[PDB]
Amino acid sequence: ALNPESADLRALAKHLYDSYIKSFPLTKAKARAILTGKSPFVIYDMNSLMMGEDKIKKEVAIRIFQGCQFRSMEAVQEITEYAKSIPGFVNLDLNDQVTLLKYGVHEIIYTMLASLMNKDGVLISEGQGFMTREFLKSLRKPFGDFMEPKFEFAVKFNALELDDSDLAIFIAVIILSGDRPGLLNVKPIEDIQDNLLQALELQLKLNHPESSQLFAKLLQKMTDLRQIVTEHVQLLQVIKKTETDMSLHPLLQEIYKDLY
Amino acid sequence: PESADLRALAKHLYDSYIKSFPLTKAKARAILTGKSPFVIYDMNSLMMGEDKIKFKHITPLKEVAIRIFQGCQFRSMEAVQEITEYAKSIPGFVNLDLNDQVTLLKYGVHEIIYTMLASLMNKDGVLISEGQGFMTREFLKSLRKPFGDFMEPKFEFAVKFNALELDDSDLAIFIAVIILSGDRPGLLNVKPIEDIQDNLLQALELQLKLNHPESSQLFAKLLQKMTDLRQIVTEHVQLLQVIKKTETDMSLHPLLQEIYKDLY
Ligand SMILES: Cc1oc(-c2ccccc2)nc1CCOc1ccc(C[C@H](Nc2ccccc2C(=O)c2ccccc2)C(=O)O)cc1
């Protein structure tokens, strides 16, 4: 049964889920309800892309690219606000706070993007729209190659059948990674992650009692996220050099500076 | 009962680990602490170090860096067969689809090699030639062109990895976990693999709780290290592509080119 130590871990899991709901406006729970049948407008081609711009709201390979960078900056702001709620984070060296965010945000972005994905497409614009995976992979130049790695990860990640209360702790574990390059004081970070890892283990045991070694299987997914990011950074360098008229927003540019 | 089988699995893998890998971490540790090894710290000590068995573990008919690289390839070829033997001792492995056995080894051996290489490293150097020698980290970093950043990423990993203070009994299970990875490309029947890895993970968790009762969340921390290994390995493959392209010897014996078809 529960015991003073495991009780403290339940309170932490409760606090993190709470802050997650407050920081992220589109939960997995809402995303799943939308995807499994309010209904979204579906963008699968050129004309439907124009019908949708009116219903929800090449220059088109560029309009999708910049929809995805505007999106990703919103997520960084949400993640940064969530990070403040992880007990101990705001007390860390401000420079290590920046480093942990710089290296953590994209691994979290792709974790949470999976919540909005099924094998056929991804929800957009707060779930008012749904853009098909075939439409995205049909884009020209390198733009058709960007979103396919994410779908591949999402389909396998989603088979773990995690809910928002599990993910709230998992993304906190991600942020508080002591191996990040350039961290000045690793021990206080590792102490916090030790506590989050304990909280996640108990959460998964209680929330998925029939799911053997879910904890370990989830931790192994950090390998797939790390590879998605480095693959993405490389594609962005290509876009930069081939499309000298396109703009990368200073926030994402600074996150990617001297990353790996 | 279930714990009994998990302890029997751990003991079985340990026993098989001892039989397949001659230089254990325990033995390497003792050497690295205190028959002292011949130390190779510069060009002259390397030349004098024919105890590195370079005429044997390399072909006659070259510059230092190339010859060292060829020596590491010979060592990796040896390790691949030790790892292969060990894999066949893992319960369930040989009963897998034979194509899947080949795929698991092909994509697993680089991860295993650099995990076990850490057993032979401290922050200042690495044991070589069955632990009879010791090549310093500074010397390797001093090699020209692409060869100077061959080993340094592995040292960085080994320093982090060794702070976990695993022993051979722990490492035996960990290595089996790596081999039974169901996400390797081209696998034909993922289910039995993930079922076996599930069992190995359970055995690893119990082993670490009994062997390191005071070390909080060591299981989780060890699993997170697989993220670093994978980045170590991808980086390493790209460097071999720069070497294969730029340091080609067109006089190289064609059979030696078939023997080293895969570079490690
Ligand atoms: C797939 C999609 O589309 C829309 C959308 C399109 C038009 C209008 C409104 C929305 N929302 C979503 C879901 C968000 O899906 C996301 C996908 C990726 C990211 C990470 C972000 N990538 C970019 C950062 C800058 C510019 C482009 C990208 C890309 O990821 C990209 C995507 C396709 C082609 C080329 C590049 C990064 O910084 O790493 C965030 C959200």
How far is Cα A174 from Cα B122, in angstroms, rounded to an integer? 28
**How was this structure obtained?**
X-ray
Ligand 1 close to Cβ of residue A69 (< 6 A): yes
Bridge partners of residue B121, in order along the sequence: B126
Range of the domain at B254: 1-264
Best of A111, A205, A220, A227 to substitute, by most chain B Cβ atoms within 10 angstroms, is A220
How far is Cα B74 from Cα B56, in angstroms, rounded to an integer? 10
Ligand 1 close to Cβ of residue A170 (< 6 A): no
Contact status of A227 with chain B (Cβ, < 8 Å): yes
SS3 B185: coil
Residue with structure tokens 């809402």?
A30
SS3 A42: strand
Q: Rounded to the nearest whole angstrom, what is the distance from the C-alpha of residue A70 to the centroid of ligand 1? A: 8
Q: What are the tokens at A155?
A: 């389909």
The reply to whether residue B226 touches residue A227, judged by beta carbons under 8 angstroms, is: no
How far is Cα A123 from Cα A127, in angstroms, rounded to an integer? 5
Q: Does an H or E element contain B126, and which?
A: strand B125-128
Furthest C-alpha separation in chain A: 62
Resolution in A: 2.1
* CB B100 within 8 Å of CB B194: no
Q: Whose CA is nearest to atom 1 of ligand 1?
A: A68
Burial class (CB in 10 A: 0-12, 13-18, 19+), A6: middle
How far is Cα A81 from Cα B43, in angstroms, rounded to an integer? 55
Residue with structure tokens 């979204």?
A40
* CB B207 within 8 Å of CB B10: yes
* CB B13 within 8 Å of CB B179: no
Q: What phi and psi, each to the nearest 5 degrees, are found at residue B256? A: -60, -30
Of B216, B224, B231, the CB nearest to A219: B224
* CB A108 within 8 Å of CB A175: yes
Best of A160, A197, A229 to substitute, by most chain B Cβ atoms within 10 angstroms, is A197
Best of B160, B224, B232 to substitute, by most chain A Cβ atoms within 10 angstroms, is B224
How far is Cα A220 from Cα B204, in angstroms, rounded to an integer? 15
Q: Whose CA is nearest to atom 15 of ligand 1?
A: A68
Which one of A66, A68, A117, A242 would you pick to mutate in the ligand 1 pocket, going by the greatest count of ligand atoms within 8 A of its CB? A68
Q: Which of A191, A117, A199 is nearest to A158 (CA)?
A: A117
Tell me how far apart the terminal alpha carbons of chain B are, to the nearest angstrom: 42
The reply to whether residue A216 touches residue B205, judged by beta carbons under 8 angstroms, is: yes
| Residue A193 assigned as binding residue | no
| Residue A69 assigned as binding residue | yes
Beta strands in B193-254 (DSSP E): none
In ligand 1, which atom is closest to the CA atom of A249? 25
Q: Which of B112, B144, B106, B93 is nearest to B230 (CA)?
A: B112
* CB A178 within 8 Å of CB A186: yes
In this complex, how many residue pairs, one in chain A and one in chain B, have their CB atoms less than 8 Å apart? Answer: 43
Residue with structure tokens 């078939």?
B258
Q: Rounded to the nearest whole angstrom, what is the distance from the C-alpha of residue A52 to the centroid of ligand 1? A: 17
DSSP B247: S
CA A165 distance to own-chain centroid: 15
How far is Cα B143 from Cα B124, in angstroms, rounded to an integer? 16
Alpha-carbon distance B157 to nearest alpha carbon in chain A (angstroms): 10
Q: What phi and psi, each to the nearest 5 degrees, are found at residue B135? A: -105, 125
Q: How far is CA A63 from CA A53, B82, B236, in A?
A: 11, 54, 37
Q: Rounded to the nearest whole angstrom, what is the distance from the C-alpha of residue A73 to the centroid of ligand 1? A: 10
Bridge partners of residue A124, in order along the sequence: A129
How far is Cα B192 from Cα B100, in angstroms, rounded to an integer? 10
Cβ-based neighbour number of residue B67 at 10 Å? 15
Ligand 1 close to Cβ of residue A147 (< 6 A): yes
Q: Is the dihedral of CA A236, A239, A241, A247 positive or negative?
A: negative
Cβ-based neighbour number of residue A51 at 10 Å? 14
| Residue A15 assigned as binding residue | no
User: Which residues of chain B are within 8 Å of residue A222 when distances are taken between CB atoms?
Assistant: 224, 227
How far is Cα A216 from Cα A222, in angstroms, rounded to an integer? 11
How far is Cα A110 from Cα A106, in angstroms, rounded to an integer? 6
Residue of B nearest to A199 (CA): B217
Cβ-based neighbour number of residue A202 at 10 Å? 19
How far is Cα A143 from Cα A145, in angstroms, rounded to an integer? 5
Q: Which of B119, B108, B92, B110 is nearest to B21 (CA)?
A: B119
Beta strands in B30-124 (DSSP E): 38-40, 121-122
How far is Cα B220 from Cα B204, in angstroms, rounded to an integer? 11
DSSP B147: G
How far is Cα A189 from Cα A93, in angstroms, rounded to an integer? 10
Q: What phi and psi, each to the nearest 5 degrees, are found at residue A207? A: -85, -25
How far is Cα B239 from Cα B146, in angstroms, rounded to an integer? 7
Q: What are the tokens at A146?
A: 């960007």
Furthest C-alpha separation in chain B: 62
* CB B114 within 8 Å of CB B232: yes
How far is Cα A252 from Cα A68, in angstroms, rounded to an integer? 12
Q: How far is CA B248 from CA B194, B251, B258, in A?
A: 40, 9, 14
Domain count of the fold of chain B: 1
Burial class (CB in 10 A: 0-12, 13-18, 19+), A68: middle
How far is Cα A236 from Cα A143, in angstroms, rounded to an integer? 10
